Structure formats: C-alpha cells, structure tokens
Design a protein around this ligand. Sequence first.
Ligand SMILES: [Cl-]
Ligand SMILES: [Cl-]
Length: 162
Amino acid sequence: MNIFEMLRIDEGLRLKIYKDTEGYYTIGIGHLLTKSPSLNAAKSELDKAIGRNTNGVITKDEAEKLFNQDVDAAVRGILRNAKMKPVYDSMDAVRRAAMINMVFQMGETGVAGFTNSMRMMQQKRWDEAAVNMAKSRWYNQTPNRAKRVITTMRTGTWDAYK
Ligand SMILES: [Cl-]
Ligand SMILES: [Cl-]
C-alpha cells in the first residue's frame, strides 16, 4: 500500500462529472472542478484541465493524470507550508501518507485548521491526536473515511486499509 492506493480507495473513480459529498462538481479520483453551482462552469473547468473538448467525460488515463498531479501538488503544498512542514518531517512514511490524504481532501487550508492535533502529532502523542482529530466537522461529515485516516495516524500501519 501507498498513498496512491490509499486515496484511490477513499475517493473512488468516476469518469463522469459528479457531485462530491459537499455537493461540488468533481470528476476522476476526487478531482474537485469548482465550487460553483453551474455545470457549465464545471464543464468548462474540466476542458481547461484536460486540454480538449470533453463534454463532461474523461477516460481512465486522464483521470489518472489529474490524480498524479493532485497528489504531487498536495505534497508540495505541505512542504511549502511553514506550519505543516515540520510536522510532516517528523513523522514516518505511513503517518505522512495520512497527512497527505487529509490535505488532498481538505485543502491546505482546511488541514492547516487542526493546529492542536498537529502539535500532538509532532510530539508523538498518537492516542491523543486521534481523539482530538475526531472532534471535527470532518469526522462528523465523513466518518468512515475519517476513521480510516485517524487509525493510520494513530497506529502508523495500513491496517484500516486491509
Ligand atoms: Cl488541474
Ligand atoms: Cl465517509
């Protein structure tokens, strides 16, 4: 297991524009297209991202293409972030994967809003961090995924994904 498979589990694969769990137009493997209510704008954002006239549908390879880009951008987002970098650097590979998943889903912004857990993380107080992370809208909204990511963080193993 690795970050790619992990996220592929959590996000799924849809080759047609769909609405995510927040009602936002998405496609591929969790690629958010736009927060606007218009499918047109969505369709438009998709064509711009793919470089062709998609008509709201892409092939698998294209989905994988966005996916690579988005994982790469999440990592690079973390590394450019003054609050997060040090937390990420302090952790082992499994736990880093958990942090990337959170950023991929919530944006550097949304994650960056877990200061308190991140501090516990950096201190290696896993159980506590897990408890704190659970008091969040994130957890209340997507509890099963949240649980998977929290156990990965708590344990440093991929058990939640096996
Ligand atoms: Cl893009
Ligand atoms: Cl869920």
